[model samples]
Structures are given as C-alpha cells and as structure tokens.
Target: MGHHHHHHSHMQLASWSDPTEETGPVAGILDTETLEKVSITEAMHRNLVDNITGQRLLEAQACTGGIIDPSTGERFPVTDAVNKGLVDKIMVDRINLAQKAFCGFEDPRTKTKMSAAQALKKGWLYYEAGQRFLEVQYLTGGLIEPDTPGRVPLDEALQRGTVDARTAQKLRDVGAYSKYLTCPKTKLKISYKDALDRSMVEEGTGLRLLEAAAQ
Candidate 1:
C-alpha cells in the first residue's frame, strides 16, 4: 500500500453552534486582521481631523461666547471641556455608544453591512459637516425669513429682500454677521447662503459628498 500526504492549506473548520444559539457574528465584522487595523487607523485619522475642525468652529462661534442650536435657538456656552481637553474624549464616548447601537446593522442608504468603526466614523464626519451650518446660524443670530426659511448674513439678507434695511442695521448693531465665513469644501471666501445656493457646500452633514467619497 502507498501512503499519500495531503496538504490542505485552505481547509477551514466549520463553526459549531448549539440548537438554542440565538446569536451570531455581527454584520460586517472585521474578519481579517489587516482590514481591522486599516479601518481603525482610518477612523483615528478622521477623528483627529474632526477634532481640529470642531475646535476651529468653536472658536469662530465663540464670538458670541457660544453657539446657538439653530432649531431650538438654545445656546451652548463654552464649557470646561474646552480647557480641560475633554472634548475628544466626550466625542469618543459618544461614538462608542453609537457604534454599540449600530452593531449588526445594515446601512439603509448604501444597502450594505456597516461595521461599528464605519458607523462611528460616519457619525463623527456628520458632526463635522454640520458645524458649518450651525456656525452660519449662530453668525446670523438664528434669523430666518419666512420666504427663504434659512439663515443668511445680514448684508446678503438685505440684498435678497429677506431682511429690511432697518432690521439688517439692527442685526449689525448687535454684532451679528461680523465675521466672514468661507465654504469648507471649496475653500472659497463666500457666504454660507451663496455656498448653499451654488451647491458648493451643503445644508448639514453633507451626506451626499460623504457617501460619494466613501464609495
């Protein structure tokens, strides 16, 4: 009888489960070490960028000592988080919680499995993108004309007939729209309204561009 040696490099053991097993691997689990490392590093870089951008935006809004929630008109003053370097940690905690909730989830927009890290990174990116919208609202004192139903710089509002000369002057007197804002994406010195009109930037989250880039 001849003895044969078999080399099976691709053989994988079948995962066993009990009849009562009610759990399995989450969707988009980082099955490979290499992919896990890559996604984690990418997430870290994006988180860093978001932190820096958020800091700059906070500074810009600090002209009024804080920012206003556009929808609620509620103000958020600069807190000890800024001085104590807690902002990053806070955001990380937030992302982690969001990731936990999103585990095993499929993205509705992309119709694909979404890893926890991907979801966390997307949440951070959305927050970063929304900063510009909130900044503009803060600069304009959260004023919105009935017709436009959006905030605009005092000068632009006057020009567009969204605000009267008296109202615009009053807004100026209150130090609204004192600083110039530029488009975050285009790097062009333009009003937020114009940026929106030209579709240079977005209203909030800029999800369309984000999705495109992700693809």
Candidate 2:
C-alpha cells in the first residue's frame, strides 16, 4: 500500500473590506449612530477612571505616555488616573448604566456575561460598539482620531493646520480603524502579518494579546 498524506489550507486571503460569506453572530449589532455624544467633562473623566471596569477599559486603550481627557486638555498618568479619584455620583452612575447596557451582554460562545474589557481584548463584536461608546462618553467624542488608541486628537491636528477641517471630519467619521497586534507570550508589539508569520498567536488570541499589553 502506498503512503497517503493530507494537506489542509488553513489560511485564506481576503480584501480589507471583504464581505462576509457566512452568516452568524460574527458581525455584532451596528449601533454607532445610536450612541449619544457625551460632554466628557473633567468630573466624568475622573468618574470613568474611578470605576473598576471603566478604569480597565481606559488602561487598555491608553498609549505609551498616558491617557488624555481631551475636554480639559489635561493628560493624566495612567497610575494617577486610576489611583487618584473623587467619585462623581452622576458620572459613576452613568458609567454603571452604560456598563450594564453595553458590557453586560451574554457571550454567544460561552453563554456567559461578558465585560466591555473582555469583549475588547477578544476583539469580539461588542468591542467596536464599546469603543465608540467610550470615545463618545469619555474621550474627545470623535474630535480625536478614532484609531491609535486616542493618541492624536483631531483638534490638535486642526490647530497645526496640517490637515483640512473637511479631511479631519472625514477621519473622525471613519470610525474604528485597525490596530497593531501584540503577542501575549512575548509581549512584542507587531503587525498582524508579522504576528501570524511568527505564529505568536491566532487571529482572535492576537487581538486579545494586543489589548492585554496594557499596563
């Protein structure tokens, strides 16, 4: 008898905006327009940092220097933001309400309650909606770059006049840009392609690793 071997194609190539062929819960509910724009006052920012879940979300989204409350034009060190806080009753309650409404959903796979942070880490459907919610409620409310973890506030870009108002508005409305992936085991920040090449992680796990890289 001759030896037999089986080869499998595990990778599939697709365009950036490729349409989904299969139908399931992979695509989450589209509710970006439903999100209300928050004023993002100093008190609300403080309250977001004070709440445990909100704090985790902010920490996950924070960049190298720290997270900025664009409303006050004040940037706080992540540690200070999380550790130092005077509770804003209204803001806290608001976060609690948003948390339950957005984060308090059942995971289809596990049929268990999933937190906003978890959904974000896993790059699940709720991640997009949750991120948009955070941006509108706590961050610059689309005045900042929708991507890059709030690194570039669009207002600053406008101040420099490097980009036109129309262009900036387009960027703001673009919403939910892609992010760099991180290796959970190595903690190496790399692109998705590089991560895939290195077998650092799977698609889902890689996204989770990216979020897990937070301080």
Candidate 3:
C-alpha cells in the first residue's frame, strides 16, 4: 500500500471593527470614554493586590512593581489589591485593564505594536481594551513575539509564585520545564526563541505540549 499523509489548511484569523466598539486583537483595551467612567483610584489598586493569589496576584507581580499604603505607610505587592466594597469592584476592574494593557496592544499598521510598559509610559494608550485580544492569544497558545514581557520559566515561575498553580501544573505537564527556559548563555535577558535559538518552538505552543504531558 502507498504511504498516506494528511495536511491541514493554513489557518487565518479575521479582524473586525465597529464604529461603536473597540477593534483589533486587543479588544480588552477600552476606549477613552469607557476608561473615564471606570474611575479607578490608588485605593482600588490596593485592594486587588491585597492578599491576592493565583493568576491575579501573578499578573500584578508581573506588571505592577507593588506599592506602599499611604494610610499606614506599609509596603505591599499587587496581590494586596482586593475588592471589599462596591468601589473596590470597580477598582479591581481598573486593575484588570491595567493588566491587559501590560499584556500589550496592536496598532492599525501591521508592523506597529506597543508593549505594556510603552502603553503606560508612552502616549499610545490602547490597552484599556487590548487585553481581550491578548487573552485569546494566550488561550489559543498561538505564536507570540519573543520579546513579550511577563515571560518566565515554568518551574522557576512556579517557585517564585509568578505563575499560578493551575498554569504551573499545565506547563509542567507539557514538559515545558525541559523545553522552555531563559538562556543561561545570554548576558542580557532574552526571549525563549532567542534563548533556545533554532531549537526553540514558537512562543504559544505550550498547550499542545501540556495535553501531551497529561497523557
């Protein structure tokens, strides 16, 4: 019998924009009008970080450098921000926007892009809604840029509490501990792609490996 092979068609994602809505990959990046209504304050930032655990805390550590409470002059991390009152809920939502912003946003020009830091520091503010797009990218485990921030080693991140427990388990199951790593050779920090060089798989392929690791 002749050998048989199967090939899948190339997958192309579609883009949509509405005059009434936010557009592009980072839909979580909200528009100005939406942001104005959010009314987030430093107090709100405090609640979400206060004693936060799992994914929320991890993201805060990744993005926010943590802060000290003025009321007590006590230092705190992002996990300390938690919602206790109605305003606290709104405040947490704001923190979520900030997190998404750090996740990154896309510009109209294909080549143009912004990092989370740039979003805050630079005037290019699109992250308020851009996070949803990044969320999809994360969930799909699609190919991501090597330079993306918040990238951490699977095991090390677990130990450092940078990665949430469920995510850490998935990464371990995928054998990411072996496959993905920060380059020991690089003088400066580098991306997984740069660290692994030619052997490195694309950034977002972890889920498949996770599935396999489970098996």
Among these predicted structures, which one has the highest TM-score? 1
Model 3 C-alpha lDDT per residue in residues 1-215, reported as the tens digit of each score? 10001121111132222111111110001112222111113212322112121122223222332222222222233334443211234234434444445433454467454443234235454432223222222322321222446343445544754345654333223212111112223332221222223121112321110000000
Quote each prediction's TM-score: 0.24, 0.20, 0.21
Better of 2 and 3 by lDDT: 2
On lDDT, the leading prediction is 2
**Among all windows of ten consecutive residues in candidate 1, which has the lowest summed lDDT?**
206-215
Which of candidates 2 and 3 reaches a greater TM-score? 3
Clash statistics: count for each candidate: 0, 0, 24
Candidate 1 contains a number of clashing pairs equal to 0
lDDT: which is higher, 1 or 3?
1
Considering TM-score, where higher is better, how would the candidates rank from best to worst?
A: 1, 3, 2
Give candidate 3's whole-model lDDT. Answer: 0.28
Score each candidate by Cα lDDT: 0.30, 0.31, 0.28
- Model 1 regions lying over 4 Å from their true place: 1-56, 59-76, 83-187, 195-215
